[PDB]
């Protein structure tokens, strides 16, 4: 079981960030690109291929 | 006594009309709203439902005539007679074709997939709708409205009794003997192969097959008998008084009113009994 211990040691020595920062980044990405989303905002039939 | 006719026939006609229109509308709605492919037995259901639909929609004119005699014109009676004849013959021919298809599917289970498809896709059209349209020529030629006393009545008017006799014989021959023989033979061959079986699924089908045969003859056998006797009266080989003629007329009228029930019984038997159709209807409803 030396491989499991080595993998755990390799995956345990990393630096994480706060959950709030990641959530804020996700929210900012969602807000920034909300304009270009045909599913969120309905597109008029003039520019609707289907 | 016209009281019996006036109070008895229109009510039965209206009830049959309502039940048949409801059943056939439901069958058409279920068949049309089917996403998957159409099997070899759904086409037969569609044909039968269409024929019963025409036979149902030709009823209100007869009901009105029973209430108040014909005053709708001359062309409309011709159209009504043509539609009635077409539906009446097409229904029984479709029933015979269904029986033949079921015989092919059951007896020849493994080596009968092309004959059934060819039979449906070509022979159904030809042998069901060409003989049915070719038999409406007398309706076009002879069905005319005539005034008798203070009343107007429309029906086939033949030059003499020979035409009446030969056309009644043709009606009997095309309406009972041919589809009757086909249905009886196919379903009696099917029954004999399912009688000795032990499985559950081979005991329900038998219980559903022996019914169908009855539902044919118990609807049609008496009526033609009433005609079969009547023609013998026209041939001057049966000799009794006017009481016999009156009771023959009453029997024919009553038994024809009884026989008009096929257009509403067929949706119950050929569509609503099967579990596959019920499952399809449940999906179609939701």
């Amino acid at each position: 079981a030396r491989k499991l211990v080595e993998q755990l040691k390799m995956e345990a020595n990393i630096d994480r960030i706060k959950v709030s920062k990641a959530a804020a980044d996700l929210m900012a990405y969602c807000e920034a690109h909300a304009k270009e989303d045909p599913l969120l905002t309905p597109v008029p039939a003039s520019e609707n291929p289907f | 006594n016209a009281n019996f006719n006036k109070i008895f026939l229109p009510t039965i006609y209206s009830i049959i009309f309502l039940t048949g229109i409801v059943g056939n509308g439901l069958v058409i709605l279920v068949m049309g709203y089917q996403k998957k492919l159409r099997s070899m037995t759904d086409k037969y259901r569609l044909h039968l439902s269409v024929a019963d639909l025409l036979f149902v929609i030709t009823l209100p004119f007869w009901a009105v005539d029973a209430v108040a005699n014909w005053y709708f014109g001359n062309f409309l009676c011709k159209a009504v007679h043509v539609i009635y004849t077409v539906s009446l013959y097409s229904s029984v021919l479709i029933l015979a074709f269904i029986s033949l298809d079921r015989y092919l599917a059951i007896v020849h289970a493994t080596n009968s997939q092309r004959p059934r498809k060819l039979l449906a896709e070509k022979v159904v059209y030809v042998g069901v709708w060409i003989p049915a349209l070719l038999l409406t020529i007398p309706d076009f030629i002879f069905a005319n409205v005539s005034e008798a006393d203070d009343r107007y009545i429309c029906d086939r008017f033949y030059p003499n009794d020979l035409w009446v006799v030969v056309f009644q014989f043709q009606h009997i021959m095309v309406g009972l003997i041919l589809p009757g023989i086909v249905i009886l033979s196919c379903y009696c061959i099917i029954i004999s192969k399912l009688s000795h079986s032990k499985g559950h699924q081979k005991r329900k089908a038998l219980k559903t097959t022996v019914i169908l045969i009855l539902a044919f003859f118990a609807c049609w056998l008496p009526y033609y008998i009433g005609i079969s006797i009547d023609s013998f009266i026209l041939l001057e080989i049966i000799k009794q008084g006017c009481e016999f003629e009156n009771t023959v007329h009453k029997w024919i009228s009553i038994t024809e009113a009884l026989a008009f029930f096929h257009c509403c019984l067929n949706p119950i038997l050929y569509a609503f009994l099967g579990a596959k159709f019920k499952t399809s209807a449940q999906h179609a409803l939701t």
Binding site: - | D101, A105, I106, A109, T110, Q201, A275, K276, F277
Partner: protein
């Protein structure tokens, strides 16, 4: 706009080809082979990389046979792919009651066979799918049962040490595991040395299954 017309014509042609292929494929019979620790693939394969397909033709009927004994993954993750096969052929080694698994000596081999048969039969996917049971190795079983009584597998057995009685008891025990008695059937046959009855028995079972399916399709029941 000839390009659009050419595209529509090509689409119609390939749609017609697909319809023809489907109509041809709907005429074939498909059987799925299951087994036991012996994998149940000895007699049937010879009488005629993961899944092995075997094709043959008997009496103007095309049979395809799928062997999945090389699929040692989770059975739950791919057993729904076979929902809709005509039948499942299950092999049981008769001369295997008084044996134990090499991996686990505590568990009986025939007990494992019964457990797997029960698991397969009562699966939610295989509700209307019939099972054809083949009991292999009957001569060795007959020669062995006289010396070794049939009590190490069935402690409740009470009968004469005769091949016929024990075979009937085993068949009854295997057929008793079925729960959906009104939707599926189990056909039992003792495999013989001659290669003229096994394929005939499979043909008869498939014909009966086809008749029962046509009863439902035609709307008779």
């Amino acid at each position: 706009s000839a390009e659009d017309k050419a595209a529509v014509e090509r689409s119609k042609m390939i749609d017609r080809n697909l319809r023809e292929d489907g109509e041809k494929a709907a005429r074939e019979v498909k059987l799925l082979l299951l087994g036991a620790g012996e994998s149940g693939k000895c007699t049937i394969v010879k009488q005629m990389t993961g899944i092995v397909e075997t094709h043959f033709t008997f009496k103007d009927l095309h049979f395809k046979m799928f062997d999945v004994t090389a699929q040692r993954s989770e059975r739950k993750k791919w057993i729904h792919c076979f929902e809709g096969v005509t039948a499942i052929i299950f092999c049981v080694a008769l001369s295997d009651y008084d044996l134990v698994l090499a991996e686990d000596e505590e568990m009986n081999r025939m007990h494992a066979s019964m457990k797997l048969f029960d698991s397969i039969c009562n699966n939610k996917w295989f509700t209307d799918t019939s099972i054809i049971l083949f009991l292999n190795k009957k001569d060795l079983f007959e020669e062995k049962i006289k010396k070794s009584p049939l009590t190490i597998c069935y402690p409740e057995y009470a009968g004469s040490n005769t091949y016929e009685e024990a075979a009937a008891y085993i068949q009854c025990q295997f057929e008793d595991l079925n729960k959906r008695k009104d939707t599926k059937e189990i056909y039992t046959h003792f495999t013989c040395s001659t290669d003229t009855k096994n394929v005939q028995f499979v043909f008869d079972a498939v014909t009966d299954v086809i008749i029962k399916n046509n009863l439902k399709d035609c709307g008779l029941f």
